[PDB]
Design a protein around this ligand. Structure first.
Ligand SMILES: COc1ncccc1CC(=O)N1CCC[C@H](C(N)=O)C1
Ligand SMILES: [Zn+2]
Length: 139
């Protein structure tokens, strides 16, 4: 699991969004596996505004942070699961790395800050949902 807390927002994987996330919906994108809900107290996570393709991500199946190089945000065909049917998820960055379903939520970080959260995985690869384009998060 896991989330990013920036300002008066909470950023989770859409498929893991709780009842309170839906009761306080701000923005959501099924094809991005993203959901933004509102928070009462002030979040202080810094979002990265960069062009990076190297980062370090947290992996709870190992309790380890991994240094990885990843692709630029794009459309990747994500196989069917119980949360979604066979579809193309947009804004997804792929890296060669380990992951398990319970790892969705771990953050990929660079020197600039928070790049995105773990979203997909399979075949010795791990995918991250990018959040760097969401400029409205800091205002
Ligand atoms: C090895 O499998 C995994 N590895 C990491 C995270 C997640 C998985 C499982 C996986 O691919 N998905 C299940 C949950 C929703 C995902 C999505 N965004 O479409 C797809
Ligand atoms: Zn960066």
């Amino acid at each position: 699991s896991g989330a990013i807390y920036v300002g008066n927002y909470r950023v989770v994987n859409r498929h893991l969004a709780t009842h309170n996330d839906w009761a306080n919906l701000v923005w959501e994108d099924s094809s991005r596996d993203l959901l933004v809900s509102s928070t009462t107290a002030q979040g202080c996570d810094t979002i990265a505004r960069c062009d990076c393709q190297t980062g370090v991500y947290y992996c709870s199946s190992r309790r380890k942070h991994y240094p990885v190089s990843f692709s630029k945000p794009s459309l990747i065909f994500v196989e069917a699961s119980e949360y979604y049917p066979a579809r193309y998820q947009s804004h997804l960055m792929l890296a060669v790395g380990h992951s398990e379903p319970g790892d969705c939520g771990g953050i990929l970080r660079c020197q600039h800050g928070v790049v995105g959260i773990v979203s997909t995985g399979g075949n010795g690869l791990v995918g991250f949902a990018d959040v760097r384009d969401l400029l409205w998060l800091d205002e």
